[PDB]
Design a protein around this ligand. Structure first.
Ligand code: HEM
Ligand code: HEM
Ligand code: HEM
Ligand code: HEM
Ligand SMILES: O=C(N[C@@H](Cn1ccnc1)c1ccc(-c2ccc(F)cc2)cc1F)c1ccc(-c2nnc(-c3ccccc3)o2)cc1
Ligand SMILES: O=C(N[C@@H](Cn1ccnc1)c1ccc(-c2ccc(F)cc2)cc1F)c1ccc(-c2nnc(-c3ccccc3)o2)cc1
Lengths: 442, 442, 442, 442
């Protein structure tokens, strides 16, 4: 595959790529095509851009394009041993079926009123009007809603600011330092990550032992997990459950919070589209805006397309990476073992040749013919194939319910017309200076 | 000097020291005496503990024990060029005087009313009661109070969340990453630091030119700097002044916020003492508690001793360090060039030899024979000698005014008896989980 | 407990203790009594000498005096994950019961004829007379006998010089280097350990899979493991089984080889005794000396007492150690958490107070009153309590079968009256210059 | 010079280089050219690849590129005081001339018949055929031949298993632990080294005095040392002679044994070549293969080239290193003091640019134009300049004699076509699993 030369030793394209990766990759697509390699910080990466190329990653077996080889070093200290990329993929495929089994309609029905209430109670602190950081706000809110829904009421009631900070300490295990440096260096963020892991695990161990002795029946996701079994017939251990609960919260929080914050700003920019979203609430749920229900959520189809469009333009997982263990073919090229193969939903979901008015925020594009339905891997915010997301439905419930409630409470505006740029320096591309103006809804 | 061997290559005692640096130094004192050496992360350090040993550092000439050699590389990219450790010491000493001339009675009198107002207005958001993170609050207030007083009303008014983040980016330049790794690595913290430095220097350039061309006589710290002059007769360039303004704010924020936070918890744990600090407010300023004046602050003796005692047990600057350029002598040992010589106010200030009830918060210890007055270098939170603090006066005015105001507003308590342990992983040590219970002062 | 001062910082008494540990301990016993402490290498050790003091260690719960804390770091890379000190003690206790059920009379009956044949065949290479290193011979023979018996014929057949070297590479994981230095140094011994671990594991995985698939009923230790289940109901994984096989071989080899070597020299020195052992072979087994059977072993009483007395004077596991997790009281003292508590079989088994003619090799001492029967923890070559050995019976079958065969083959003598001194530079103390004179018996 | 950056603090490229040093250096050569630098375990190494660059090291004065500075620490405890890297280089140069005078034709003529006899006698144990470890056999054989030739018959008669172990203890002085850790630590290897040194010295002292007080005339290497003088007129002390005698054995053994073993396998792999070597024996010595003589060894040309080609592909001393004491210039670069400057015989002797079919074993490459005669430092298995070997002639006598003899006894083959890979974990690279098939020669 074509190789993009850089005269800068070791660093290669690091600076330019870090500054503007989408522009870097779109320029390369124009110049070298859908498949190309480059060096950055001592590693070779090979990209697959566009649906046809990306299909290799999305279709391939883990034995060929391996996820653990790239992610385990970073994730295993955060999520825990015996879970995710710390086990053989077939074990993780079973754990994912266990998790999926609890993300069902019965539970989603319960989650809606829990989330709505959590949201209304959080935003009382915003008062009738002002200008505040909506990203910080959603982050704090989403850690509460995710915990309430995915861990349950017992665990959620223990999530004070201390435990919230522990989760922030775990997050800090995902850094440039952790990627670049050996783990045996006693860096503060490493020690803080390991401390938080031990302390959260302990919180979960007690809660789990409590639940196991309890005589009561509780139909929640925790209970799905205590009841689950492998094809073996073997149940999950306390440590496996706890590892899974940590994963559920990290997965549940940052992908929803960034996406909810970008959509706030897309809707703040497009005031008519926001108005429409608010009017859809009256139409579907009634003029008197009663408590939200799951059945009503399915009927919020404009808000649905708005979320869908937010994920097109700002997918919170911007990249999917694998390690090539065996030789792989695409577009006539042969990628050898050792290349790290990458896909970028951001680049694919915005490619000129497939998306008309690619840079425009337009939810209604999905009511016409479009690459989301017309192609296989042009729209891939939740991935596809063996490593694909199991949380799309929950995420949509969480975000829909939060933004429905937020729309009912407030009208949102840009400050001096400013639309946030993308902060590329964070692992997750958050909107820069994400302060939003708000005032009471009519 | 006796060497504390570690068989661990490169790291040396890094892990044990990072976990509990104070306890590590106290144990070393008990086993090796007041002067000892060790390796940490590639480097040789020699400590001077106790008053008699520490004197070598405090009385030393910067030619012999050198500050720039150990600090320049980390500070120059934060504060700026031609300032602090980026210039020969004799030049920096003149800049300290320029700054000191501006930290005077007349200006302190203006600051009291300003700081008091900032404090009342910030703490409206807390309402009548609740449980909130006092450390975060004090950090947010103090950046305002420190800017209002040290920079001016004009620069202050421009201090929004965005610019406040710019300052945090600048704090982020003091990291292990920055200490360990080459500066040309495009790490996010490095870039943000360099970006934040240009954007702040620029906000200063604009206010520095506004003032020089204005006709209005304003008597403030900013003006003192603009008027000030070297022994040459040379005035300060815009960039010399701006860099000093940066230093001023970093010097004036977290030293006072951590300390202020700790005193909060010391007073929350000892209610009887808290009560007495409140009654002293009445007793000194009047039953009706009128606006504060600089004169009233000098008569707040119990409050003064609470601050002094907070600084004894939790000094924000845990270590002062120099590079030995010439052979030094102390307690019968000779320290060779290349060694880094260290003093710790924290250790000196709780040494078993010299402080009774050493770990107790007892502000009335200073009403009796004690090493603060009894010895020269046992109590040294603001250092001593050629490098000692010039902001001590302003720090007490800031902290006294805020906590006087805070005690008038609220009575503070612990949550479930918890006293914050020390977070050693932050540059300045911080209280862990520093959420405090508060309610309206009768 | 009384503390034994050393003026040598860091090392403390390590030199003297490395040279003459038994003498150090015996003199400390006389001077300080049965419980005392000292420092080496920044680590504080407390000894319990004599039956009454040792009782604390042997009787303690692992939650109080903990083996993992002191052994896990070295053993886990050797034996593998999920086994021995890498799991909570209760799981290891179940693992030990699985192993113990495999060490039964039906298997012992098979082992005697396996071991006799391996022994006759190995010693073909010794011819009619000569002078050779018995210790090397016993080590080479025992790795075959232990693998043949404990792993089975399939795995045994794959035990060539290459695999033997891999086991030596695993052994090399137990070193002063692995104890003293951190694991992230890429030392040759660590790399060879880790490679040997993967390569030995791989051999076991194939043999394990072979047997599961196979339809033939084989009654051997491997099969005991494949058929075993935890109280859980859960069977062992392939990796747990392989880990346990590695452990079986390492436990089965050096403990028997060193003891057998020592017994060789004790018998070479006391020719009258050696003759009596030879004649007991004729008396018990028959004048024509037919093949050994398991049932004759129990009637070989003199030989039994010879092994007992060799273990008395030369126990191959010369120390047992634990980390104190909770305060422990003995002899009026309180041992605090953090001390490593320590017993020596060697010292207990020769203490002047209880053993008459304590340094004499006198197998017949057990035919009158003696500390092994009259005291609880004076004779403890295989330990006692929760960490006690499961392999005593096997070791006696192995050693008796080998030495019965050797006595039938050869008469052994010393070389110019030399009796080997103890080599304290090896992990398990070996006899120095263990070359022995032999000639065809009768 | 270009620097190869590693983001791995301290360790630098330690792991990658230790895994595959030749591949590392050859890749570096391609990317950076003949001179480059990198960090490994806290040290800066600068390599000179190819003849023209390596010239700097081989042509350098010891005052500029110093050998004691890098080697002294490890070698002195092994060889003894007063010898080799423990004295200034001019003194060692004189000592080398003394050894040179001992390694003369009169002595070599004696050695051939000594070596042939030890060889025939040693391989008696091998029988008519089998599969045995040729590397271990050669190592054991060579310690005997080297000691018989270089120490004489008296000392050699005392070389039992015990003494051979003392020599292994000595070699054990050359460890990563001795490189990393202070000499005062009483580590096993340090203790065994120093004990072995004392005991071997005592064997040499008696033998030496035995000769000085004797009347017989013995023309052997010891006598040359005893009759030798410095320019001073000063003769060697007993400790100088004994130090040199240790050096002679350690240099004489492993360099020849590893090289001999590699050649076994090159010859077993290339049976046509092996047959030609056997036929050469008959051609030069005669059909009846009488006792070897020195004059015959000189005419065994094909065997000479097989050795030369073995040293080409597997030089036992893989690196030559010096401390830069003064700035040096090469390839338009300046190497500052403190850099460790290195040459790799293995890379030079394999370079893509110079050697056609670079990885082929082709002894006849030397009968055409080739870089061993066409360039100065492409072929340097024995070094060059002030530090070059004085043992090449003895080596060639020892190896030729042993293999001529082995070729007369046996034909050799690979086992299942396995060619030993390189074991990079040993000080001297060794062949992995060096068991070889052999059968009585026609
Ligand atoms: C808007 C919300 C979310 C987005 C955009 C998102 C995105 C993704 C993507 C792109 C992948 C594929 C990763 C890859 O191919 O390497 C993925 C996998 C996954 N996600 Fe999500 N996700 C979301 C929410 C959630 C939630 C709520 C959960 C759990 C409740 C979750 C759990 C997972 C899991 C378990 C995987 C599987 C990873 C693997 O098998 O390697 N996600 N997600
Ligand atoms: C509680 C508040 C503060 C504490 C505990 C504190 C402590 C110290 C200490 C210990 C030193 C000595 C550093 C050394 O010699 O290595 C010092 C120096 C200094 N402080 Fe502060 N300080 C505080 C507040 C301030 C403030 C508010 C300013 C300015 C407004 C300031 C400006 C300085 C300056 C300019 C130096 C001299 C640096 C040098 O000479 O190297 N400090 N401070
Ligand atoms: C002469 C031969 C042997 C001796 C002297 C010996 C000695 C010991 C001793 C003293 C302990 C207690 C360790 C402690 O408390 O820290 C022990 C434990 C043990 N031995 Fe042996 N042993 C021998 C042979 C074997 C054999 C043949 C096996 C297996 C077949 C074996 C397996 C074990 C196991 C599993 C433990 C348990 C360790 C623990 O629970 O922490 N041993 N042995
Ligand atoms: C195949 C066998 C041998 C090889 C490949 C070999 C290789 C070398 C090499 C490459 C050097 C240069 C060291 C440097 O420049 O850093 C050297 C030096 C030396 N060799 Fe050998 N050698 C061998 C056998 C011997 C023997 C048999 C002796 C003595 C009988 C010996 C004694 C020496 C001595 C004394 C030096 C001088 C070291 C110095 O001056 O720094 N070598 N050898
Ligand atoms: O090999 C170890 N223990 C042995 C003790 N043993 C042998 C026979 N009966 C008991 C061992 C323990 C458990 C097992 C084992 C356990 C479970 C199983 F299924 C199979 C085997 C096998 C063993 F060989 C071992 C080795 C070294 C150390 C060690 N810890 N610290 C050091 C140390 C300290 C200072 C300097 C050098 C080494 O060494 C601890 C344990
Ligand atoms: O044994 C060493 N050198 C050998 C090199 N040699 C062998 C044959 N021809 C030359 C050597 C050098 C001088 C002599 C010698 C000296 C004097 C004399 F009278 C006779 C012989 C003998 C030798 F064996 C030696 C070994 C190790 C090291 C060493 N330096 N660093 C390391 C090292 C570094 C990192 C990790 C581990 C080891 O190892 C340096 C020299």
């Amino acid at each position: 595959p074509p190789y993009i030369f850089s005269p800068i030793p070791f660093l290669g394209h690091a600076i330019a790529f870090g500054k503007s990766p989408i522009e870097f990759l779109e320029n390369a697509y124009e110049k070298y095509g859908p498949v190309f390699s480059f060096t950055m910080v001592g590693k070779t990466f090979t990209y697959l851009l566009g649906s046809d190329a990306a299909a290799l990653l999305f279709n391939s077996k883990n034995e060929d394009l391996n996820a653990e080889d790239v992610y385990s070093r970073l994730t295993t200290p955060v999520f825990g041993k015996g879970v995710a990329y710390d086990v053989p993929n077939p074990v993780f495929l079973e754990q994912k079926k266990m998790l999926k089994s609890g993300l069902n309609i019965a539970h989603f029905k319960q989650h809606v009123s829990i989330i709505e209430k959590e949201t209304k109670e959080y935003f009382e602190s915003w008062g009738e009007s002002g200008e505040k950081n909506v990203f910080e706000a959603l982050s704090e809110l989403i850690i509460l809603t995710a915990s309430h829904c995915l861990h349950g009421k017992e665990i959620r009631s223990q999530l004070n600011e201390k435990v919230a900070q522990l989760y922030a300490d775990l997050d800090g295990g995902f850094s440039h330092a952790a990627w670049l440096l050996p783990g045996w260096l006693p860096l503060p963020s490493f020690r803080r990550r390991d401390r938080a892991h031990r302390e959260i695990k302990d919180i979960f161990y007690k809660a789990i032992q409590k639940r196991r002795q309890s005589q009561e029946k509780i139909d929640d996701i925790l209970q799905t997990l205590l009841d689950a079994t492998y094809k073996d017939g073997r149940p999950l251990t306390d440590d496996e459950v706890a590892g899974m609960l940590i994963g559920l919260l990290l997965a549940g929080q940052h992908t929803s919070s960034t996406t909810s914050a970008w959509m706030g700003f897309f809707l703040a920019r497009d005031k008519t589209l926001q108005k429409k979203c608010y009017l859809e609430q009256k139409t579907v749920c009634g003029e008197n805006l009663p408590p939200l229900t799951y059945d009503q959520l399915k009927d919020l189809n404009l808000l649905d397309r708005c979320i869908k469009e937010t994920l097109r333009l700002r997918p919170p997982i911007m990249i999917m990476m694998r390690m090539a263990r065996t030789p792989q073919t695409v577009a006539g090229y042969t990628i050898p073992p050792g290349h790290q193969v990458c896909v970028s939903p951001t680049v694919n979901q915005r490619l000129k040749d497939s998306w008309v008015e690619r840079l425009d925020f337009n939810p209604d594009r999905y009511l016409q013919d479009n690459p989301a339905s017309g192609e296989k891997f042009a729209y891939v915010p939740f991935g596809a194939g063996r490593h694909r997301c199991i949380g799309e439905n929950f995420a949509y419930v969480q975000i829909k319910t939060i933004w429905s409630t937020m729309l009912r409470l407030y009208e949102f505006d840009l400050i001096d017309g400013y639309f946030p740029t993308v902060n590329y320096t964070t692992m997750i591309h958050t909107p820069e200076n994400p302060v939003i103006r708000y005032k009471r809804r009519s």
